[PDB]
Amino acid sequence: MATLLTTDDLRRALVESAGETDGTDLSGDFLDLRFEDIGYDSLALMETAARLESRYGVSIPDDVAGRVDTPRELLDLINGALAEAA
Numbered sequence: 001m002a003t004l005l006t007t008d009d010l011r012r013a014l015v016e017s018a019g020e021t022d023g024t025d026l027s028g029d030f031l032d033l034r035f036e037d038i039g040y041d042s043l044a045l046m047e048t049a050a051r052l053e054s055r056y057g058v059s060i061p062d063d064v065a066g067r068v069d070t071p072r073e074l075l076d077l078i079n080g081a082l083a084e085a086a
Contacts, residue, residue, distance in 0.1 A: 003056060004082055007031075010052070010075045014040070017047040031072030042066025045074065052078055058085060 011026040018024045024038060035045065042065065049065040052058070058081040068074040 002082055002086065004079045005052065005075055007075075010048075010071065010078070013048045013052050014038075014044075014071070017044050017051060026071065031070065031075065033071055034069055035071065035074075036069070038071075048074065049078065056082055056085070058082060 007026075007029060011030065014026050014030075015021060015024055018040075026033075026038075030038075035041075045066050045068060046062055049060055053060060056078075058078065060077060060081055064077065065074075068077060
């Protein structure tokens, strides 16, 4: 059945990596947002992915992690790798 990331799962990654709700409101849907729009660098995106990567046992290239403009594609990317697992 696999284990995919919901809006809460990915939200936590962003929030926890940034700190603790530091203006980073990913409450509800945040897929149609942009990382620059929410004050994120790819550096934090690495950290975001890494925290999830470690739990789910996935691995995404740093260059690919720090390439997503929208949180949607970050979710899409990890869920893609999650589907590459079983």
